[PDB]
Assembly symmetry: T
């Protein structure tokens, strides 16, 4: 179907001021533009609140919509986020802008990867665009 949810977690609202010079609004505009090219509709949301993130994931579970998720630090710490993402019946693509394996050791474990469909790391902001293209070819 058309709709794809792009969910960013804590601190991703500060993009542009490791993660590069593009701002979160620029990111939204890039995503929406690529999604229209692809025949999808992208709904892009960001929150520093875990409960707010869980609500958005819950809604994608009930609507059976795919999710492209950059959980930020919660990647490495939240079992609650993992359990909500485990209910999604449509694909889940875990995105990271930086290469989490070229940093601290503790960033090289994700609670999320074992239940995601796939993972894209280190490809910068284009990683989101590439995740979108995967989803457009997989319907």
């Amino acid at each position: 179907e058309l709709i794809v949810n792009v969910i960013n977690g804590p601190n991703l609202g500060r993009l542009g001021r490791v993660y590069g010079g593009t701002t979160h609004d620029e990111l939204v505009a890039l995503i929406e533009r690529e999604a229209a090219e692809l025949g999808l509709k992208a709904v892009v949301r960001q929150s520093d609140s875990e409960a707010q993130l869980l609500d958005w994931i819950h809604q994608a579970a009930d609507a059976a919509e795919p999710v492209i998720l950059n959980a930020g630090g919660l990647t490495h710490t939240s079992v609650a986020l993992r359990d909500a993402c485990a209910e999604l019946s449509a694909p889940l693509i875990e995105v990271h802008i930086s290469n989490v394996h070229a940093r601290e050791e503790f960033r090289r474990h994700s609670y999320l990867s074992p239940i995601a469909t796939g993972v894209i790391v280190g490809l910068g902001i284009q990683g989101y665009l590439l995740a979108l293209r995967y989803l457009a070819e997989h319907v």
Copy 2:
């Protein structure tokens, strides 16, 4: 520039008979077709021999050409492969067809990821295509 090397390691010659139903020749034809669309030239090679893989990586180092590398099992075991890939001055994108984080614990460490530019896992054969598209936008 135009040229991109796609290097597959041991056992990837057997694709199609976890990794899906597409054969290695089909993979080559998909890659070459997408690369022409993108304005690149893809040189796709596969070997079960580590020394053969090292030679191909060496040549990409000397020519300063990017590499999209699916090292297979060597991902988790070869320091020699890592050291040769560390000499590449152009981007290196680590690809895995399956989600290595939804399998055995020992597949969740890569010698390669810390020196790659980025990593794509679990997106099937499309992961190669997406890696190509990253490289076409990054020249």
Copy 3:
């Protein structure tokens, strides 16, 4: 005394749609019915927000009321939740609907168990009812 607090953490609002087919409202009605049978009053609350959970625990600490707590994923990750529960002077019973020891290894550690009075796991929704009955016999 009469009052018992039943606190559910993140994702437990979604019960019924591992954790079984009963909904969170059904759970509330089962608990309140069993508590009246037992001569207690049950106050049942659920939140995906850690701060909201901490507030409820704080209030039970100040009122010296017992707590039956199913913290969900926070069980395995929150030191903050643990520290607030450590102030309770009345009993704390840790409940889990599923058997956390028949799942992933990371679910077999609880920040909570060392400061709880006791723990009930794998007995489904009845675990809450049984926790209530323990508290009715222990006043």
Copy 4:
């Protein structure tokens, strides 16, 4: 059906002289009284001999009768006990009188929990009674 086996392992014969002031005979009389209230028949047995415990578990496997098991120290050490309990087709409820998570680190692993239906810890002698009530509601 009516019958429930309550099996205590080594040292539980010494109850009453961490584990509280009730004796093993008092425990038997409490259990039998609660089981009659519930419409069940409780057969309560205790042994310091692992082979004797294995025989009792074997017999519950062949008769398809549920077991409430407090294995004492064997909880943390016996793979043999685990393997016999794994054959039970009726529910197995692991009971501990003390909170094993508020003690030594080595008491926080059980060979038994991964194959039990559920686990009750730290609720004192009432834990047995509560296990019985779970079984009476689950037939």
Copy 5:
């Protein structure tokens, strides 16, 4: 410059009812009094909400103001908090009222210490005052 942010995390609102008999309002009044003595202005804030804490840290990053941070339990669990604190360009002093090394083993790791300027533990409420004095000598 004059301004110093003092940020307390979850449960620190309950001070006074390990952490001693002074209340959070008393703490605020002590800090403000010492800061005026020193020629600074202290802005003291407390929240049980991680997102609220992240917002305050974000604002100190944008204003280039120093932070004295007692994150409570989040010290040991939050990568998100760490990443926001890593953006601060002015000093960050990690404070703990209790000696975290004389307690549970899990309190002896901090996500925060590697990116802080310095750390003060076990000196009670005076630790905040001493952190202030460090900052007044370092401008």
Copy 6:
């Protein structure tokens, strides 16, 4: 009372030629000046000899005088130093000039912290001055 012992361990005699540009004699003069301001007497001693350090600690134990201790490398290696410091009945403040948590992993464990009153790290030479001020307020 008036007297405070400031004990520096191996290599701290070389300060000034990570640890900054102030010399050990300058440090002594700074400490003595701040201690007089505070109404105390500071006795500052440095040795590369563990036995010499143990003797000084022994004497503070017998006199019931507080100690501010920067043990240098011995922090991470000496159980003997720990055991002598455990006899002190007056406060012990562990000081480190550098942030030991922003360095090698092996510097992030101290034999000393669990028996100290408190710990100050990364605040440079001022850490000693701040430790003094804690002791002047705590008599």
Copy 7:
């Protein structure tokens, strides 16, 4: 010489009702038949009692007779069994019916293998027969 002891440990009396459909008596009859073919005499014994197993091993030590040993769960837990088997001067062949390496991680360590002559796992009941044939060729 002619005699070979075949010793089965706890739970192996229940064979036939992972370990397959053959019963312990059938196993005995298969072994005795193969041993006669080979010119040996097989003495096959089974016990759920560790002390009973130790006695049988002791007797093989004093008689200098080889042992084919399937210790069941005791494989992974008993140092006492290991020490008695270490006295055997004739060969000891450790047998397991299932593949212990395709199961839980804890089954992949044996106290016995380092002192055995050799080990056969995963070959079902034939493993015993093959162990016998090894011993008939090694006299």
Copy 8:
């Protein structure tokens, strides 16, 4: 069917000059002789080249022929070898001439055992013969 592949890995060409006095050609002649006795045909191959080993395993996968494999050092290091052996649909028997559990700790883990049918260790060269006999009884 008749055919069984016996594959030896690196260094096994040097047998006879821990592993005993029989040469690799003697081993081949022993195997072929026992296989004819059993009504099978044994094809025995040895290589120090991992790629050569992978090719032989690939061919057994395509022909659906059983494999008796002594991978030598590759046992403990190769994920590539493991993945090729995982495709075999006929039985795989892992053989080791020495007892790998009476040696260095690092020899007590095999990448191969979890996907083999069964494993024979420490029975010398007879282990191959016994593996053959297992396969002759299992068709």
Copy 9:
């Protein structure tokens, strides 16, 4: 008082045929002779049965008699033995004939030492005699 229990666990009945050339009866006669010299009565018992050992320990707990215990392999494996020994109100001296620290790594942990009064290892059979002499001076 006069009576001292000397309890030997599994395999110690075989002394004399690492542990030296003295037999268990010789050991008994040496102990009884030294105990009479010392004004005590020694009751020396040995069993390969854990339940039998637990019974003897239970009886020493009820009589408030000291125990000198060489548990053999059970030292390193039994939590049940530990828990029964923890009830003894008179001294418990753990004896080992061999030096358990000059052997396998797994012999360097004892479940028993943390609850014993003291431990004697590597002094051969004299260790028992020395334990007796400690008890004669400690009444």
Copy 10:
């Protein structure tokens, strides 16, 4: 022969003001008295200096005299002390006054025990006397 060296390491000079109320001089007088009873000569020495301890051990190595050694904290930290003690050709008995296994985890490893003849822990000051008696019976 007659002579026995009793060597105490750091902090043991402070005995009497865990380790009990006897002073180091009292200890010396007790030892010398027991040694004369036994027909030996005891030379008792104590130092907080590792080099001084090494010299004394060196001299016992050259004279081939036994050593009873309580190294204090150095037990757990010094490889240098271990290597010098490894040269002794006469017996070495490691003594500890307290039970090192009922304390911190880090006290339960000794660099010394693997090269000692034997070890006595937790028997208080009598442990020295008992070590002497072992040596008098072993010449």
Copy 11:
């Protein structure tokens, strides 16, 4: 005798374009020149193929010639290489050009060092020359 084998493993053919500016041919010429000075003959070989390396080691084993070996990445990964080197009866000197202990943690373990005569690391290309000089003095 005169002959010394110098064996370089994978990637060492690329020297000169961490490892410095000298090329592999320059290295060969330096070695041969120093070996003639010393009265030896140096045979210097390099391969990226493990099987090729094993063959060269095999030949040195059969000829009883010493080996100076820089295995590159295989140092840290190959058990096969280790086992072939373990057959050498003449000295084996492990050489590394860089300091492997000032790099990643995984480079600080060698499969080779425990069976080598000696190891030289971090001395650059001169390390080979120094290894030669050791061998010339040791015949």
Copy 12:
């Protein structure tokens, strides 16, 4: 320049009575002779006192003279020694006479290697001579 410091740590004064038959004075005479051949001056010092070793290292730091250091046991235990050696601006060569990797596991970690220029192990006393020759070629 001409001068090279050769520093030996604890127990190396006892050479000659694992480490071979040459005495420390013989070692000094060998070193001085080789150093004169090379055009250097060797100053060779040995101490069992860590403080004495630190003083010598300090002096080499201030004079900018190279150091060849065999720290003995302190290699594996001293952070203080490491920190003083880290100040040296001229090369530091870590020498060990024995192969520390063919011994106990605990000898295979050095605090020193990560800050040394290079390391020579297992080449006996010649290792010192070879270290000298490295330094003569590196000025």
